[PDB]
Amino acid sequence: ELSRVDQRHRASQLRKQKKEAVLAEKRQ
Amino acid sequence: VRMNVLADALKSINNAEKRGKRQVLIRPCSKVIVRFLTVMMKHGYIGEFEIIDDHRAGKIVVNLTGRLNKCGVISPRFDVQLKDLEKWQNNLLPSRQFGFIVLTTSAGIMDHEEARRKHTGGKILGFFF
Amino acid sequence: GRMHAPGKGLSQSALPYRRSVPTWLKLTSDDVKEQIYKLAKKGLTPSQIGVILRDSHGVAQVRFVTGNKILRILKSKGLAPDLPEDLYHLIKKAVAVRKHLERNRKDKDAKFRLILIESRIHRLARYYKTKRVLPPNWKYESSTASALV
Amino acid sequence: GKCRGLRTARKLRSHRRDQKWHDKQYKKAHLGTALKANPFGGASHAKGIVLEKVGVEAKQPNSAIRKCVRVQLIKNGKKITAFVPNDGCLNFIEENDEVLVAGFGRKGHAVGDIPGVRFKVVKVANVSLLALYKGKKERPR
RNA sequence: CGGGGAAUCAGGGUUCGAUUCCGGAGAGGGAGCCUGAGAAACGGCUACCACAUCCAAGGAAGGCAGCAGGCGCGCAAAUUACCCACUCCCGACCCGGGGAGGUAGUGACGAAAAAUAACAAUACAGGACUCUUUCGAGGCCCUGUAAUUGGAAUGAGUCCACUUUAAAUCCUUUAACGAGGAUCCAUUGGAGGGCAAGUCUGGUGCCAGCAGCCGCGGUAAUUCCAGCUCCAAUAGCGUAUAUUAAAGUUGCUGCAGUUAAAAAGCUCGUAGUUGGAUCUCUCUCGGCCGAAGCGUUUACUUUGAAAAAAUUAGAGUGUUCAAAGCAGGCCGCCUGGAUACCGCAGCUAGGAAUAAUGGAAUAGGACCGCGGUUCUAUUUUGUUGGUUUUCGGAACUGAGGCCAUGAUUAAGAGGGACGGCCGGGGGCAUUCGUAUUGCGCCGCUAGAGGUGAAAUUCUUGGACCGGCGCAAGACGGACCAGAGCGAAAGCAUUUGCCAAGAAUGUUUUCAUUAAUCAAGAACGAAAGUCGGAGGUUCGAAGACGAUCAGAUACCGUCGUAGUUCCGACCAUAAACGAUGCCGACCGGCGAUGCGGCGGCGUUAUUCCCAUGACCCGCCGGGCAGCUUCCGGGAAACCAAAGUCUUUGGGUUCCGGGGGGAGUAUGGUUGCAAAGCUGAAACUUAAAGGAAUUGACGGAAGGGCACCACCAGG
RNA sequence: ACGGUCGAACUUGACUAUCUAGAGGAAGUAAAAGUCGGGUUUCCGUAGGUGAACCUGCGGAAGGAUCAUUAACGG
16 A cells, blocks of 8 residues: 555554444444 | 785795695785795795895795695785684684784784784784694 | 787887996987987977987987986976877877768777777876876867867 | 675675575565565464355375365455364364464465465364364353 | 664674663644743643533533553453552652552463472392302392382471561461372373384274375375374473574675576776885973974774663672572671673874875975065163164065985886788778579470479470570679687678778887776677668568378478668677686697797709798797696586685676566667566476486397298198 | 734645445356367577467577598609
């Protein structure tokens, strides 16, 4: 991916997706 | 071209010593070669030599005795401190009993034992055994 | 071993050990100097002056008799050329080869030998600028080559 | 021949690093491409979810069927194949089971009779294959 | 995050350092501030951005990369405990506070010590001492099997108490209980080789499976699954992964490039790197000495002072030993809490070999005195206003004396000159030779062509053939050789011109001007591409004709581009010696080319003198050969591929198991073709190089047989 | 409240880069025993012949097994 800020942005997006899935699962 | 004439002199005398010859002609002659030959002569490794004087760079004819196994030059002339001389004599000399790293200090061109005695460090020239 | 040729020649002069003047030579230093001066006024290079002195007058080495070499005598008197001998000869050779090349375009061998000649000229120019024989702003040009010779 | 001057240090070190790049181990370690192509991402063990059971045919001079398991890793999402070591240990693995998987030992190279498999199963459902094989523990589901 | 440092390690080195000490940065992201000595502070404020809590729907309150803890994340990491007693810090302060820090809990990260039992008697069993020819006879120990006995010492544990401690726990000390092998019971891996220990037994039958690698299993499995036995380490042992040593498989020490991976097609050339000898301490101020300059400046080497501790090496010291710690020892005293190392860079004083550098050659050069011009003396002209005090110091100058006045030599380095040569070296013009093709004429004939045979094709409108000419483009045979020239690719008719070149000869000249060379620049076989001309032969493509279970390559005839020349492009070859360039040394020999030297003789029909050709030696540079146990190398072989573990003459390029692959992508050049630079994923236990024997020859020769034939029964 | 400064951030287009749903297209794999069926010594660089191999034209190599002859040349 290169371009360190873009790699960290990819990591933050994956973090947010996993966090949203986990928080959706724990509300049920 | 020709560089470091001491290397040429030592290679010539080593080639002729390996061949079993009695005398070596080396050219050109310089003062450092004369001092190296004198250092070898004072330890009885070569013997008498003559400096044939041309008005050019001169020549030397050395007499050979079969006491020399290897005479060698170290290029480039590395800076040998007194603490680092033990590594050098571990690398180049065949044993702790004999062999000589010739090296030049401000006190002159001498052996490693004389450099140890006079507490001075210098630049490495050779070894012979 | 030549610097632009793969040949390894050994042909050169060999002086004897005696630097002293021979006994049969009845020429003093000032007479030899005057002969050099009149050859310079005739117009010769120092090498040609030495060849004439060796072949005809019997003077083997001028710096053994006079104690000074030819170019220093000419420079001290003031008759030395502006540009040196070998540099002038190489520039003249370059001019001749360039004239041949403008005559004949398809001569590739002449072009290659011209490149070698200019390499020699640049080497001599660098050496003479280092020794402050030539001015630092001196430059050889292909266009300004025949005018200097 | 080598340049053996006194001022030739930068030439020697530049040549040494440029020819260091021509090694296989150094290039695999330092280029950062085999690290990104490694499914484990430079980890000792990984944890995945079982997708399927596979019978991989052995390489020709030995004729047998190796029981491997195709899993999907959790942390990156890659699909890999892990060889279940001992006999009867495949029955402990079930589809959609959590498995701890390690390599074979040749660091990314296919090992022995099994073609195209870099990995072997270590734990099945948070208990080891060795304890289940020796009957030391029971596995939940 | 950077250091101190850590792991590994002969020497060099390689890798790691988020982490308790130092410095930096930041409190979800940026930004702006208030107060204060100190903040752009967040356990302070104000925003916007992103998440998010209480809601009465108006509003308010947010910041655990602090201590515990939780979710999530993952292969991966502890208690929502006790204390301010030790260590310090803060405050108005001997008194309060501190999730700093201490103490316990979790803890097989890792390190240190160290149980799982020993002995005696008997029964066998060995090895020995004494006596015996020997057998044997004993009192000398040792070893286990003890399906034999026997008590003695124990720590694990149970657990009074003391001690430890802020209060406890643990350790230490001690009451009582606490050991006979079915116990207070030691495991983790393996037993074909590497690599230590079974050709044991049962089951399976290329299945299940084992196996890091080689390999095992298809009915005797030394390798699988088990039983027994054995082996290694041991309260520890496996497996995965990163890293280090092995790896002289990254080579500075210390690798390689003929044939195994590899030297650029060739030459020049800036940067870089390397570079031949040679040159043997003093004048003023102050008490024989201290101040002032040093001496061209260095690099080199030695010494000194600075370089926080902790870590490392190491001194001392019985923590019961040890890892540790900085303590402790003696009857109030005596002591310790060292030392070394701490690259490089910066200070400092000696040494002067080595390696750079300079000091006088238009002599406006040193050292002395003899003078001028200008600027200036801070005191002697008692107090002075002064034109002048004198003296002395700086800068430009005129001559003079003085210096042995001042230039290391001429590399078996290089450049340049001069000389007679020499060569298929190059460019331009010119000259000739034949062959082939075509045409014209003449002659005589029915065949000519091509093949292993044929066939296509030409041909009595007269082919082929023989003769006389003409023209067109092409090619420079034989002489032509292991001969020559050129940087290489390459170069062969005659003559003239043009500009170069090696070598040789010189008692010529310059005096280090040199060697290899990233960047860059010229040349570069053939084939190919653009614009022009020309097309004799040959000729890819293409057209036919032969030939076949299947032929669509071979063969024959014709023939396009091309092959030729001119001007622009491309920069590729087995562009080869499959062997970088420069320089030195180490065996020999006689042929050849060029040049030079010394010569008896034959020759130019005996030549009148030199000169050319031969003949005999010598020297220098070359193309090569032969010989050799110089020594090298895996070898064939090599006088270099030698002078290599006795490893360093300078320097350029370049290789790191085979494939992917010289591929994709990117850049660059080219009209294009493509050239240059150039991966990764993945795949694989091999691929190769040299030699050594000879099953098997569809390889060849001989010999033998009515279990072979011939002529027969 | 005007103006200035520091300035988070907001909106609009361009260059991107990342996360994440997708109608369809082209494939392959497992399931069908379903239906029909002789030449070349070994190469290299270019060009053509259907891309590659291969063959041929041109120019190059050996990394390809040297038998026989060779003293007169004067009248």
